[PDB]
């Protein structure tokens, strides 16, 4: 329970439910609850509540709130974003009997439940006690959300791009993947890996030395070393760069005869093209106050190193000084001081975890390097490739400058190119999604929704459709059977998983489904939209199926003897000539040929 | 054993094939019809699905959601009891264990838990045999039943002596030709021989037969029998339904059942596991039965005919880079979206660009036949190249010779019935086209370019 | 493939069904000439000809015609036991309650042909190597099954 709830609290909330997909109350997935008064004590007037809730967010004062339920719903909706500008914005309230049923849009249900509990607790402290610390709870909520299946920078970026592009997407348990389509036009993957990536190329990319040999035999700039007895520049001697070496002593890669440089760059290729590049810069510490120690560094840690906020330039600076030796090579105490003499660098290897940062370098690369990267890319069957280079200057050609290729990676993280410390953002997920899909039209399949139907009618309809397209695959599901074309399969006890199984099939061309009142009230739906709707003696609930249609859609309703047909918002009504079945009405209205 | 069968089948159908060093792969097509792979894994097979196949206890739930007959048991990390489940589920009629009454229950070596924690599942599917089904491109192809070894003898003989006598049988003699092999022994034989037999001391009373090892091992004197023609249609449809859900070319399914001739909805049926890179040698050379040609199906998946595995090729014996650029530019005017590769002794170019030339000839041509976007090849082979190692490809669509020597004439030997040949000697021009011959003379200050610039139109 | 024409094989059929099938085919290829033969008569397009006493000469007469584009033939059990077939291989095979002997009509087919078998109320279809099986509605006719499979010969 609310551990703290005790003694008194004017309000009360009960009956939490989770709805996936379209539901009677809201268009999207939602969490539903019921609000009421205890009536033992009189709550404070709305004047006090408003100003207090009108502070933390000025957007609340924009619209009138009327009763308490709307105020509570708007407060929950605004807090749900977790101050990260998530695309979740939806709430609704309906007064039923003396109670008020409220539904709010959700993606992770547990997070929204916790948000509701926290807002209720905040509300209840506005009278008795009069204190609260929301900032301590918001951090916990943000971490909980980020530790979820839907929580991830790349994952959420792809989710947001899909929502903007209007592309369906849902999570597949058991396997543990994410799907972005219906039927034949589908793609499954986790993070940046996809199901169209070869099994052989990925294994080859991790061999290190063999990739070096392969790249060298095509005439590419790579280090010339070979991979202790003699073996220490016996005849490994070119531009040499023993006790010290042995005490200093990856797999025996002896190596670097040809050249070396300072600056490290990363290039990203998508679908055999060049998009985005990044320079990695290590941590440095300077300013006049004298002994930086952990000081100018925990002052540097003051204006935006706000490691805590999940939206910040860069995190904080931590040590595990193993490069103390490194600095010791430069010669200074951990603890002594200097003034305006240089920049000093805490870590030699730029680790974006501990203080290293990223700089955009996209619009200042020589076209020759672009051509070289594109040529390297188009030799593997992957979709995203990452190349690591070491250069003295990226602005000129590689033939007249020192250059090198060190590493090639198959599953690159693309967070750096989205949230750079210095520079302008570059969108990489848009390219990834445009690789597979072009519009929203070619990501969906025709869907037919019924209200009540039997097996024989389904077989008749499927045969009628197959008389036109003989090579299609058609899936049909109802309350007592499931069919592919004309054959019968096994039915699962949980009704909603059958639609999932039909949508996972990689050969489906058309879907036929039936939703009654009990199923619709238990769990809302699984898909969004329809191309043809048929109602026979609809009830009050079983008409919300008309809210989700497109501009080009057909709706047929039969109420008693009366029949109504709506095509593109054109209404034609008739009455039954005699005792006739409804099948004759829609058997001639098959116009999904397009 | 499986590589050579693919090579023989490819040679029979006139399909190129060559080995790629520093990668350990074999390639079949030339420029963009290429297919690379090793054994029965190819470059179109997916990474996610192949990885997911090896994760047991997760394929089981996936196959159970869409109703398929799978055993009913669960994982175990207590390595203690949880014998409740042995009962939660019916009874432990013979509930079995493994990883990777309630008495001889895990007292049977307890599965000798080898690494952190895993064991048991049901054994209701204790129906008797072991069958293997193979699917290529989502279609049912071949089936096979596994049977272990047996002995048959009498008092006059001993286990070891009879085994040695049968091991010298001519049909079981060990050669690549013979399907069976030498009978060997191991700890499993001793483990199984505790029930009624004795370790090399029993005396076999009459024709009563022994099976020795329980799980058949094809290396240790086990064998297999063809069962393709005795499979019910329902099982075939079930196999197709299972195999259509993965992005793989070849899939293998292990089945345990009582009778393969009746529907899985009427008898005891069980799916054990699914494999991603099956071995197909047991289906090609069975102990008893007819063979099935599966490599032909594998190859027909990709190439319908030989024309689907080649690209146009032009070969010279003496040419310069400027002429190559002129020819490439003329060709690009009619096919603006192509990719052309040209190589000679002076340089190599890919669509109006210059690349680095390798020190060792005959390797640049290999690099050009590996590029997965090539549409047309232009190459030069003079006398030194032909005397060093020889040509790398086979056959060409256009041959141009200019004052050839004795050796270089061999370039006219390997041509098709529709190719064109041009020869120039002094001021004389000889042309052969579609089997018809022509001969005439050039004027002064004439160049050979004007002769073939008009002939270039035929490769389209 | 430059030396062959499409062929359809039955094991029992009447002259009423052949006319309907040929009429259906002619709607998409108006300029073809199609020849059909069975135990009751012989047809070229929609017209009637004379039937010979020796059954196997009618097929030869049809294959000798210098204008034919498609052949439809029936081979029952007695015909197979008398002298055997005259051509080799077929593109579409239809079987309705076959015997033990007639099943050999499925032995010689290509890799992309279509086979239809009906037994009682059960329908089995093999198409491009894929199998399918279902059941009729106790009042339908076999004509409704193969009328939509004639797209493959085109």
């Amino acid at each position: 329970v609310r551990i703290n709830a005790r003694t008194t609290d004017v309000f009360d909330i009960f009956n939490v439910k989770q709805y996936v997909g379209a539901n009677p109350y809201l268009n999207q997935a939602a969490l539903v609850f019921d609000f009421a008064f205890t009536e033992s004590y009189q709550p404070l007037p709305i004047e006090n509540y408003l100003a207090v809730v009108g502070d933390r967010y000025p957007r609340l004062k924009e619209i009138e709130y009327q009763s308490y339920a709307e105020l509570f719903a708007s407060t929950v909706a605004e807090v749900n974003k977790l101050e990260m500008d998530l695309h979740l914005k939806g709430w609704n309230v309906k007064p039923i009997e003396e109670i008020n049923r409220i539904a709010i849009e959700s993606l992770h249900h547990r997070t929204t439940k916790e948000v509701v509990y926290c807002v209720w607790d905040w509300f209840e402290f506005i009278t008795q006690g009069e204190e609260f610390d929301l900032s301590k709870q918001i951090a916990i909520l943000q971490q909980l959300f980020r530790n979820s299946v839907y929580g991830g920078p790349t994952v959420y970026a792809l989710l947001r791009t899909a929502n903007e592009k209007h592309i369906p997407a849902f999570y597949l348990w058991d396997e543990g993947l994410m799907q972005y389509g219906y039927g034949k036009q589908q793609v499954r993957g986790i993070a940046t890996t996809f199901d169209v990536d070869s099994h052989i190329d990925s294994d080859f990319t991790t061999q290190k030395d063999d990739c070096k040999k392969f790249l060298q035999e095509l005439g590419f700039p790579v280090p010339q070393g070979d991979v202790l007895a003699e073996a220490k520049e016996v005849a490994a001697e070119i531009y040499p760069v023993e006790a010290a070496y042995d005490r200093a002593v990856e797999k025996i890669c002896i190596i670097v005869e040809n050249s070396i440089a300072g600056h490290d760059y990363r290039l990203l290729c998508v679908n055999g093209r060049f998009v985005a590049a990044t320079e990695r810069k290590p941590a440095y510490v300077v300013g006049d106050g004298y002994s930086t120690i952990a000081e100018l560094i925990e002052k540097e840690n003051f204006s935006p190193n706000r490691s805590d906020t999940p939206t910040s330039p860069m995190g904080k600076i931590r040590t595990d000084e193993a490069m103390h030796l490194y600095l010791e090579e430069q010669g200074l105490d951990l603890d002594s001081v200097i003034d305006r003499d240089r920049t000093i660098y805490l870590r030699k290897v730029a680790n974006l975890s501990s203080g290293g940062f990223s700089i955009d370098a996209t619009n200042r690369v020589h076209p020759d390097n672009i051509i070289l990267a594109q040529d390297i890319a188009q030799h593997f069957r992957l979709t995203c490739l990452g190349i690591d280079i070491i250069t003295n200057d990226i602005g000129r050609s590689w033939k007249e400058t020192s250059f090198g290729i060190i590493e090639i990676n198959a599953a690159p993280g693309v967070y750096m190119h989205l949230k750079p410390a210095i520079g302008e953002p570059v969108d990489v997920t848009a390219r990834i999604l445009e690789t597979f899909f072009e519009t929203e039209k070619n990501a969906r399949i025709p869907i037919i929704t019924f209200n009540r139907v039997s097996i024989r009618q389904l077989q008749k309809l499927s045969d009628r459709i197959l008389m036109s397209h003989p090579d299609w695959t058609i899936g049909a599901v109802c309350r007592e059977g499931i069919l592919i074309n004309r054959s019968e399969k096994i039915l699962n006890r949980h009704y909603n998983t059958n639609v999932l199984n039909l949508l996972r099939n990689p050969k489906l061309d058309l879907l036929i489904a039936e939703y009654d009142e009990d199923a619709l009230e238990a769990e809302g739906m699984f898909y969004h939209g329809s191309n043809l709707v048929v109602l026979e003696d609809p009830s009050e609930i079983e008409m919300i199926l008309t809210r989700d249609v497109f501009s080009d859609s057909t709706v047929i309703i039969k109420q008693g003897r009366e029949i109504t047909i709506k095509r593109k918002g054109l209404l034609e009504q008739y009455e039954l000539e005699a005792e006739e079945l409804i099948e004759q009405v829609y058997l001639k209205e098959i116009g999904t040929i397009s | 054993p499986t590589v050579y069968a693919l090579l023989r089948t490819a040679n029979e159908k006139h399909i190129p094939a060559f080995y790629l060093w520093d990668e350990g792969l074999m390639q079949y097509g030339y420029g963009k019809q290429q297919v690379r792979g090793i054994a029965t894994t190819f470059d179109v097979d997916s990474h996610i699905d192949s990885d997911f196949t090896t994760q047991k206890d997760d394929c089981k739930k996936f196959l159970q959601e869409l109703g398929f007959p799978v055993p009913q048991g669960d994982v175990v990390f207590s390595l203690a009891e949880a014998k409740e489940v042995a009962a939660e589920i019916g009874y432990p009629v013979a509930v079995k264990p493994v990883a990777g009454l309630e008495a001889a229950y895990d007292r049977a070596v307890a599965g000798i838990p080898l690494e952190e924690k895993i064991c048991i599942i049901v054994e209701n599917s204790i129906a008797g045999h072991d069958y293997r089904l193979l699917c290529v491109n989502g279609r049912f192809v071949a089936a096979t039943e596994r049977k272990p070894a047996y002995v048959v003898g009498d008092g006059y003989s001993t286990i070891a002596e009879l085994i040695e006598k049968e091991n010298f049988s001519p049909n079981r003699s060990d050669t690549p030709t013979s399907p069976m092999g030498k009978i060997r022994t191991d700890e499993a034989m001793h483990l199984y021989l505790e029930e009624q037999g004795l370790d090399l001391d029993s005396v076999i009373d009459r024709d009563r037969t022994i099976y020795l090892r329980k799980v058949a091992n094809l290396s240790s004197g086990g064998f297999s029998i063809d069962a393709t023609n005795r499979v019910h249609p329902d099982n075939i449809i079930l196999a197709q339904d299972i195999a259509q859900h993965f992005r793989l070319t070849c899939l293998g399914i292990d089945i345990i059942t009582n009778d393969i001739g009746r529907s899985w909805k009427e008898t005891s049926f069980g799916i054990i596991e699914i494999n991603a890179a099956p071995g197909v040698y047991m289906h090609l050379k069975p102990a008893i039965g007819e063979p099935v040609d599966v490599t032909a199906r594998i190859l027909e998946t990709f190439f319908e005919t030989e024309k689907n595995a080649r690209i146009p090729i032009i070969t010279f014996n003496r040419v310069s880079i400027r002429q190559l650029q002129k020819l490439s530019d003329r060709i690009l005017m009619s096919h603006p979206d192509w990719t052309i590769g040209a190589v000679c002794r002076e340089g190599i170019l890919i669509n109006r660009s210059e690349k680095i030339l390798n020190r060792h000839y005959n390797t640049n041509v290999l690099n050009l036949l590996r590029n997965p976007k090539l549409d047309l090849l232009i190459a030069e082979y003079d006398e030194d190249a032909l005397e060093a190692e020889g040509m790398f490809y086979h056959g060409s669509n256009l041959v141009v010779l200019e004052d050839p020597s004795e050796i270089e004439m061999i370039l006219t030997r390997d041509v098709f019935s529709d190719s064109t040949v041009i020869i120039k000697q002094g001021r004389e021009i000889t042309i052969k086209r579609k089997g018809l011959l022509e001969q005439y003379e050039l004027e002064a200050e004439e160049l050979i370019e004007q002769v073939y610039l008009k002939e270039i139109g035929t490769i389209s």
Side-chain angles (χ1 to χ4, degrees), chain A, chain B:
Chain A
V1 297
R2 221 137 73 109
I3 284 89
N4 56 303
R6 65 182 181 88
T7 59
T8 59
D9 184 1
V10 175
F11 313 100
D12 196 67
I13 296 92
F14 43 84
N15 289 140
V16 290
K17 292 296 181 182
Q18 323 175 11
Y19 284 75
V20 190
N23 50 89
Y25 315 109
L26 194 49
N27 186 340
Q28 318 261 7
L31 190 75
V32 185
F33 55 94
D34 303 70
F35 192 81
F37 299 105
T38 310
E39 213 180 0
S40 299
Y41 301 92
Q42 193 72 11
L44 307 176
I46 322 181
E47 299 290 342
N48 197 277
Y49 295 81
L50 283 233
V52 177
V53 84
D55 289 345
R56 298 296 299 278
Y57 315 97
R59 292 182 183 174
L60 269 62
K61 293 179 179 179
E62 295 290 344
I63 57 182
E64 305 292 344
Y65 285 163
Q66 190 184 352
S67 57
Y68 299 82
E70 284 70 11
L71 162 74
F72 203 77
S74 187
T75 295
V76 174
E78 288 293 339
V79 178
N80 195 21
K81 294 184 185 298
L82 297 188
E83 213 162 5
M84 295 173 52
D85 282 328
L86 307 187
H87 62 291
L88 264 46
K89 48 175 197 61
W91 53 279
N92 213 30
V93 180
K94 207 178 179 180
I96 296 180
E97 298 185 355
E98 293 177 350
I99 294 169
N100 308 89
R101 201 172 296 172
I102 308 179
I104 61 171
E105 186 172 357
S106 170
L107 184 63
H108 193 19
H109 295 301
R110 179 182 303 183
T111 295
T112 299
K113 185 190 302 180
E114 301 292 339
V115 163
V116 169
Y117 277 5
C118 291
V119 174
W120 187 19
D121 279 60
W122 187 38
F123 251 74
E124 184 275 335
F125 267 36
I126 193 167
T127 316
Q128 186 173 355
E130 306 278 10
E131 183 178 2
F132 224 87
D133 196 50
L134 312 171
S135 301
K136 190 178 181 298
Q137 303 299 289
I138 290 187
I140 302 300
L141 297 188
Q142 286 180 337
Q143 182 154 353
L144 184 67
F145 173 86
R146 98 159 192 87
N147 204 20
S148 74
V149 167
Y150 300 83
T154 49
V155 187
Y156 188 80
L158 280 162
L159 295 174
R160 175 191 299 266
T161 313
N163 175 268
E164 179 177 2
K165 286 289 188 60
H166 290 359
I167 287 176
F170 51 95
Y171 186 80
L172 306 171
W173 307 84
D174 306 327
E175 289 180 319
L177 296 177
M178 184 81 53
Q179 181 176 330
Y180 298 85
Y182 291 156
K184 44 188 293 187
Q185 356 229 18
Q186 73 173 53
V187 46
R188 311 172 284 114
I190 167 179
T192 38
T193 317
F194 295 88
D195 62 338
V196 302
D197 291 6
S198 173
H199 178 60
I200 291 185
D201 296 0
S202 302
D203 283 8
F204 183 65
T205 299
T206 76
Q207 291 291 274
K208 293 179 179 179
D209 58 87
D210 292 336
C211 293
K212 189 184 61 178
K213 222 170 179 180
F214 177 83
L215 290 178
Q216 176 187 39
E217 224 177 12
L218 275 74
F220 287 139
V222 304
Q224 302 297 332
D226 289 345
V227 46
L228 249 65
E230 292 177 350
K232 152 62 173 171
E233 291 177 350
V234 63
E237 42 185 10
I238 296 169
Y239 296 90
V241 63
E242 193 179 13
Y245 146 82
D246 181 61
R247 72 177 184 90
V249 170
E250 163 178 2
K251 291 179 179 179
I252 61 171
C253 292
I254 194 66
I255 54 171
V256 175
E257 325 294 326
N258 166 61
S259 68
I260 63 181
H263 296 251
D264 300 7
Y265 291 74
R266 190 180 203 85
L267 276 72
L268 181 275
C269 297
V270 164
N271 199 28
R273 308 288 291 185
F274 174 80
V275 283
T278 276
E279 174 182 2
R280 293 182 183 174
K281 189 178 174 183
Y284 74 103
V285 270
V286 263
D288 111 283
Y290 49 69
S291 63
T292 71
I293 186 167
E295 185 178 2
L296 262 52
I297 304 194
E298 183 178 2
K299 293 179 179 179
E300 183 178 2
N301 248 307
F302 296 161
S303 175
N305 295 39
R306 293 182 183 174
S307 71
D308 289 345
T309 69
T311 59
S312 64
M314 68 193 88
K316 55 173 53 185
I317 305 181
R318 298 186 176 182
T319 59
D320 187 30
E321 292 85 357
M323 297 296 180
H324 51 103
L325 312 149
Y326 159 46
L327 177 63
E328 209 178 2
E329 295 302 320
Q330 185 64 60
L332 295 174
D333 289 345
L334 177 63
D335 65 9
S336 203
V337 175
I338 293 169
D339 193 1
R340 293 182 183 174
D341 184 1
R342 328 182 183 174
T343 58
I344 273 301
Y345 292 95
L346 302 179
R347 306 167 66 92
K348 183 178 179 180
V349 179
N351 192 31
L352 235 147
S353 318
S354 170
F357 4 99
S358 60
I359 312 176
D360 180 17
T362 299
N363 289 337
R364 51 184 184 94
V365 279
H366 203 292
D368 210 271
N369 304 87
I370 295 181
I371 262 58
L372 174 72
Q374 289 193 355
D375 293 5
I376 299 187
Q378 58 179 29
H379 270 245
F380 311 101
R381 266 183 160 260
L382 314 175
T383 41
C384 299
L385 198 61
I387 321 174
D388 291 330
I389 62 181
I390 287 186
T391 314
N392 187 89
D393 179 62
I394 209 68
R396 298 190 296 167
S397 168
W398 58 278
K399 308 164 184 176
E400 61 185 18
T401 61
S402 61
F403 210 87
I405 303 178
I406 41 184
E407 201 82 355
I408 61 171
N409 296 122
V414 296
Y415 198 22
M416 307 174 305
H417 312 262
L418 291 169
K419 227 69 175 179
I422 327 173
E424 284 186 329
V426 183
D427 52 272
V428 299
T429 59
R431 263 92 274 279
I432 296 185
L433 283 190
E434 288 178 7
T435 293
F436 303 112
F437 314 100
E438 165 69 20
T439 77
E440 64 173 346
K441 184 183 183 61
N442 50 25
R444 302 178 56 97
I445 62 175
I447 302 185
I448 289 181
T449 313
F450 268 77
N451 180 27
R452 216 240 71 97
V453 75
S454 296
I455 284 182
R456 302 189 60 181
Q457 318 182 33
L458 288 178
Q459 293 182 358
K460 196 63 175 297
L461 181 53
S462 64
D463 185 15
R464 178 80 63 180
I465 300 182
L466 281 178
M467 286 178 56
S468 299
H469 311 83
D471 52 79
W472 275 17
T473 306
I474 300 177
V477 59
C478 75
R479 203 66 192 192
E480 63 185 342
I482 174 172
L483 305 174
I484 288 88
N485 293 284
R486 308 279 261 95
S487 309
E488 295 197 10
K489 301 296 189 291
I490 303 190
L491 193 71
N492 197 276
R493 52 188 300 103
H494 189 323
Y495 180 77
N496 238 10
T497 69
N498 301 317
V499 193
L500 174 75
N501 286 349
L502 282 181
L503 287 176
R504 231 300 246 153
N505 191 282
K507 304 207 299 178
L508 209 67
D509 288 8
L510 191 144
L511 179 64
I512 296 177
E514 168 253 23
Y515 273 109
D516 59 327
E517 177 172 335
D518 302 74
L520 196 58
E521 193 177 15
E523 289 294 334
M525 262 189 181
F526 215 86
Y527 56 99
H528 186 285
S530 297
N531 293 260
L532 194 150
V533 193
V534 170
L535 288 319
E536 177 175 8
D537 293 58
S539 74
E540 293 177 350
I541 300 180
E542 305 176 349
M543 203 167 300
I544 61 190
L545 309 179
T546 58
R547 307 193 71 87
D548 300 331
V549 289
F550 305 106
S551 63
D552 191 77
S553 175
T554 300
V555 185
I556 293 182
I557 306 184
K558 189 179 72 60
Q559 184 178 347
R561 300 298 183 177
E562 184 183 0
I563 55 175
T564 313
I565 289 87
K566 170 185 173 181
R567 335 182 183 174
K568 319 179 224 274
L570 279 66
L571 291 81
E572 176 57 45
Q573 54 177 353
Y574 285 132
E575 293 185 355
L576 274 182
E577 180 180 4
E579 45 168 17
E580 290 184 341
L581 309 180
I582 199 180
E583 56 182 13
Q584 190 182 9
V585 189
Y586 60 77
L587 270 181
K588 291 174 65 175
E589 294 299 332
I590 302 305
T592 59
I593 294 169
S594 70
Chain B
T2 58
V3 187
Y4 181 74
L6 282 160
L7 285 182
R8 169 192 283 266
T9 307
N11 174 86
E12 186 176 351
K13 297 185 181 303
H14 304 305
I15 293 176
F18 56 97
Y19 190 85
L20 298 173
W21 296 90
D22 76 78
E23 297 190 52
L25 298 184
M26 191 81 60
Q27 187 181 328
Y28 290 93
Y30 267 160
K32 59 175 174 57
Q33 337 271 17
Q34 56 165 265
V35 173
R36 300 136 46 207
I38 168 177
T40 42
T41 56
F42 300 94
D43 60 339
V44 295
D45 296 6
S46 176
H47 184 47
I48 292 176
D49 312 64
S50 181
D51 198 70
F52 175 69
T53 279
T54 51
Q55 285 178 337
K56 300 175 265 62
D57 289 345
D58 290 1
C59 290
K60 191 171 305 306
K61 300 180 181 299
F62 182 78
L63 294 180
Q64 175 183 292
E65 286 304 307
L66 14 80
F68 290 149
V70 299
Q72 294 300 320
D74 191 275
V75 329
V76 175
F77 59 88
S78 104
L79 339 109
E81 293 177 350
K83 60 185 180 180
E84 293 177 350
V85 175
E88 178 178 2
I89 306 301
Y91 64 89
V93 23
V95 153
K96 151 174 179 146
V98 85
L101 295 174
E102 293 165 359
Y105 159 62
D106 289 345
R107 162 86 179 66
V109 107
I112 15 156
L114 62 80
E115 248 302 320
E116 73 185 342
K117 344 179 179 179
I118 294 169
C119 255
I120 80 104
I121 329 213
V122 94
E123 217 178 2
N124 186 340
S125 296
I126 184 167
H129 304 98
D130 288 52
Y131 288 88
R132 178 81 135 192
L133 314 179
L134 182 74
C135 302
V136 173
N137 199 21
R139 292 144 169 81
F140 170 78
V141 169
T144 290
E145 172 192 6
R146 296 192 182 105
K147 186 176 271 66
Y150 69 102
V151 64
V152 44
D154 247 15
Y156 328 114
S157 51
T158 299
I159 303 301
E161 291 283 57
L162 194 56
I163 286 181
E164 289 191 338
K165 183 178 179 180
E166 256 60 27
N167 212 319
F168 288 165
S169 302
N171 62 274
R172 203 184 289 268
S173 178
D174 54 327
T175 59
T177 299
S178 179
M180 314 184 65
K182 178 181 183 60
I183 299 184
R184 305 174 61 182
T185 179
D186 199 76
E187 306 167 338
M189 170 180 173
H190 300 343
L191 261 55
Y192 194 89
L193 284 180
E194 53 78 31
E195 181 178 13
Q196 58 187 205
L198 277 311
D199 203 1
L200 314 174
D201 304 325
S202 183
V203 175
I204 302 302
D205 314 67
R206 277 176 64 186
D207 290 345
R208 189 170 58 94
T209 59
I210 294 169
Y211 280 154
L212 289 81
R213 217 151 324 109
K214 179 62 173 171
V215 174
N217 180 275
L218 294 179
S219 309
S220 176
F223 55 105
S224 55
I225 182 177
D226 175 80
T228 309
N229 295 318
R230 337 190 309 257
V231 185
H232 203 272
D234 284 4
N235 310 345
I236 294 180
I237 301 182
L238 178 68
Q240 297 181 166
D241 290 4
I242 291 182
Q244 76 178 346
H245 279 285
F246 297 98
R247 255 180 168 267
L248 301 175
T249 299
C250 305
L251 197 65
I253 308 176
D254 282 87
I255 296 295
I256 178 171
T257 184
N258 176 33
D259 175 66
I260 198 67
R262 286 191 292 167
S263 298
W264 61 273
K265 301 194 283 293
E266 309 294 335
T267 172
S268 300
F269 203 82
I271 305 175
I272 300 305
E273 60 175 342
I274 58 188
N275 307 269
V280 306
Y281 190 67
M282 66 174 69
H283 303 275
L284 288 169
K285 214 141 298 182
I288 295 100
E290 310 176 14
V292 183
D293 195 4
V294 300
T295 47
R297 317 298 295 159
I298 297 183
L299 243 45
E300 289 170 3
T301 297
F302 301 112
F303 313 106
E304 178 181 350
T305 52
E306 52 170 324
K307 316 169 190 175
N308 294 17
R310 298 184 60 98
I311 60 173
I313 300 183
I314 303 179
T315 189
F316 286 80
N317 75 326
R318 184 98 294 168
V319 75
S320 298
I321 176 175
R322 199 200 223 96
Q323 316 178 40
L324 288 175
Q325 302 191 6
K326 272 287 304 300
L327 187 53
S328 306
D329 282 57
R330 171 135 308 182
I331 294 183
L332 279 175
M333 289 182 183
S334 183
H335 305 273
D337 49 329
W338 271 16
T339 302
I340 306 181
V343 60
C344 72
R345 278 283 184 183
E346 298 181 1
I348 176 167
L349 40 150
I350 304 183
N351 242 348
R352 304 170 181 168
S353 302
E354 196 192 23
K355 315 299 183 181
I356 296 188
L357 196 74
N358 189 281
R359 308 299 301 185
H360 178 258
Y361 208 79
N362 222 48
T363 298
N364 311 264
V365 47
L366 178 140
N367 292 346
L368 279 181
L369 288 178
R370 169 68 168 79
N371 187 318
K373 301 186 60 184
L374 212 68
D375 296 19
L376 180 74
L377 180 64
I378 305 182
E380 157 187 336
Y381 271 94
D382 71 77
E383 178 177 346
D384 299 322
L386 290 176
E387 271 290 342
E389 290 182 342
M391 302 182 61
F392 197 85
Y393 52 88
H394 193 264
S396 49
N397 298 78
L398 177 63
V399 185
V400 181
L401 295 174
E402 185 179 13
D403 290 83
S405 67
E406 247 288 344
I407 282 82
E408 302 184 12
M409 294 297 300
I410 215 65
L411 283 183
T412 63
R413 195 242 320 271
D414 292 322
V415 288
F416 307 108
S417 293
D418 197 71
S419 51
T420 309
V421 186
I422 297 177
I423 303 183
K424 169 192 180 67
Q425 281 179 343
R427 309 182 183 174
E428 314 175 1
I429 293 284
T430 313
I431 305 185
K432 184 169 180 184
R433 181 192 326 170
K434 286 177 177 301
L436 286 179
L437 197 59
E438 259 186 347
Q439 182 161 7
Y440 63 88
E441 286 214 2
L442 287 181
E443 302 181 3
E445 66 185 348
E446 278 271 27
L447 291 319
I448 197 180
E449 312 175 351
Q450 312 175 32
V451 181
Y452 62 74
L453 275 192
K454 71 183 179 185
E455 295 302 320
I456 203 66
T458 63
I459 51 92
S460 299

